[PDB]
Design a binder for this molecule. Structure first.
Ligand code: LA6
Ligand code: MN
Ligand code: MN
Ligand code: MN
Length: 514
């Protein structure tokens, strides 16, 4: 709670300035023509990989699109599959990542039907491990690939850079991380390379520092809004979680053009944090039922008449925030989304009530019934609604209605989110055992120990990602690929924050030197 309002207002990054933005345009051009001189397919694939991990890919989307579509055109040619496990895995990953069909059969040559995968090259095993997270349901080569590579990478840790790479891939594969989060680590990896492109590296450092400066300015503005509502003064438990909330919102949507999206997400998350504390710590069941009903009615007069005192400000802050959100979209693009957004908020609040009734009844649901409700209460459906409504111009009515139909991709993405959050519960918190989350439900239902339940839940997430990979590749859903990314980035942020939940200070506030 050190990064308070006064601290945020005091920042004055040098990289907001117009001179830096000029040198960035200069470097972007010199990089675009250097990309023209990359003609060998593996070099092109390694180029895309580098652009993505450096945080630079959204500046070169046409150039990446061209490389990838040309490689797709060519990769059924006769002697294309050189049978380099590293190169085959890199290509499989990048093509699947960007929605191009590639069969799991590209790996069958590295695999004996009796003894499994045969490889001793760490580079190829690492790349195959990353590629296995792009698997679909029922791809037994890819499942077997993951078994083989994770076993090999674990034994790798029982050369100093090799151990670090194995550790990093085991705790967070590339498919499970949003692009900017890794940028500072990879930027240093990249400059320590003999063959580094020097302009690219300099562009990566500059764009990282400019992004920080952009976010600091947004934080000054969001900070003032939080101060004005004064919830942190009324409710002694309403701690300032603004920077933490902004971190989630930046993981959901990092690009400069999504400033409004990050603002609405940050304030939504700060309010969710307070409301959630009310529902599973401070409110009595009778109070929780009035607040639920006041949300459902969406009637300020009723709410001020009937709510407890310590709930009136929290409700009116939500109410006015959402009504101004609706106003902003109406003004911007003449779309009326109030019923949608307040419906999404109601679903969250209702899911919270269900959990509070479970807790007072000392009822312990089976994992499946817990997750049905828990995927809503983790805020997945609300957050993708918020992201879509604040991050899309023009809003497509058909696209919004698909989100409101509770589609499969939202269902399974939010289940992962919920499982991943519940894994953040600690061991001493399982023993007092008051309110039951994923681990306790699974232990009660299977008799597994806590340690085994954690491992089974971690495997469940990896299997559920396989379903998400299928919905992401479905070119026939109403969700654009842009909208789906908000959702995946939410899940990825939960994976990242389980590891690190000071990296937020490092992401937002300390530039990369020179
Ligand atoms: C921040 C965000 C994007 C969504 C809210 C869910 C989340 C990840 C939390 F950390 C909220 O607290 P908590 O872990 O207490 O949520 P609970 O487990 O009580 O439902
Ligand atoms: Mn809760
Ligand atoms: Mn909680
Ligand atoms: Mn939790």
């Amino acid at each position: 709670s050190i990064w308070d309002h006064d601290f945020l207002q005091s920042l004055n990054s040098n990289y907001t300035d117009e001179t830096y933005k000029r040198r960035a345009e200069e470097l972007k051009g010199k990089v675009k023509t250097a990309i023209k001189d990359v003609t060998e397919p593996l070099d092109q694939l390694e180029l895309i990989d580098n652009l993505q991990r450096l945080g630079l890919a959204y500046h070169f989307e046409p150039e990446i699109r061209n490389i990838l579509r040309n490689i797709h055109n060519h990769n059924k040619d006769y002697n294309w599959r050189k049978e380099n496990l590293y190169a085959t895995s890199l290509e499989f990953r990048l093509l699947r990542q960007h929605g191009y069909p590639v069969s799991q059969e590209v790996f069958s040559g590295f695999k004996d039907d009796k003894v499994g995968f045969i490889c001793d090259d760490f580079k190829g095993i690492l790349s195959l491990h990353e590629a296995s997270y792009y698997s679909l349901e029922g791809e037994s080569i890819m499942e077997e690939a993951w078994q083989f590579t994770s076993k090999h990478l674990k034994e790798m840790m029982i050369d100093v850079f090799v151990a670090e790479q194995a550790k990093r891939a085991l705790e967070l594969p590339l498919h499970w991380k949003a692009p900017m989060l890794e940028a500072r680590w990879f930027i240093h990896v990249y400059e320590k390379r003999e063959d580094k492109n020097h302009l690219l590296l300099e562009l990566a450092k500059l764009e990282f520092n400019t992004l920080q400066a952009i976010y600091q300015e947004e934080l000054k503005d969001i900070s003032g809004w939080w101060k004005d509502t004064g919830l942190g003064e009324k409710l002694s438990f309403a701690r300032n979680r603004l920077v933490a909330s902004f971190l989630w919102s930046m993981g959901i949507a990092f690009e400069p053009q999504f400033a409004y999206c990050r603002r609405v997400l940050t304030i939504s998350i700060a309010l969710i944090t307070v409301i959630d504390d009310i529902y599973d710590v401070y409110g009595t069941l009778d109070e929780l039922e009035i607040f639920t009903d006041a949300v459902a009615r969406w009637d300020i007069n009723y709410a001020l008449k009937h709510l407890p005192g310590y709930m009136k400000m929290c409700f009116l802050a939500l109410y006015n925030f959402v009504n101004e959100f609706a106003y902003y979209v109406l003004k911007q693009q003449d779309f009326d989304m109030l019923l949608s957004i307040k419906h999404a908020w109601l679903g969250l609040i209702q899911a919270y009530l269900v959990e509070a009734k479970w807790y007072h009844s000392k009822y312990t649901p089976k994992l499946e019934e817990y997750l049905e409700n828990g995927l809503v209460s983790i805020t997945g459906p609300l957050i993708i609604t918020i992201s879509y409504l604040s991050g899309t111009n023009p809003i497509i009515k058909k696209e919004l209605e698909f989100l409101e139909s509770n589609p499969d991709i939202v269902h399974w993405s939010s289940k992962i989110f919920r499982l991943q959050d519940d894994l953040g519960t600690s061991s001493d918190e399982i023993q007092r055992g008051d309110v039951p989350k994923s681990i306790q439900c699974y232990m009660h239902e299977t008799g597994a120990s806590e340690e085994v339940a954690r491992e089974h839940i971690k495997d469940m997430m990896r299997q559920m990602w396989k379903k998400v990979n299928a919905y992401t590749a479905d070119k026939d859903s109403p969700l654009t690929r842009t909208t789906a990314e908000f959702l995946l980035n939410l899940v990825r942020m939960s994976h990242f924050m389980y590891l690190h939940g000071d990296v937020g200070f490092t992401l937002l506030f300390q530039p990369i030197p020179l």
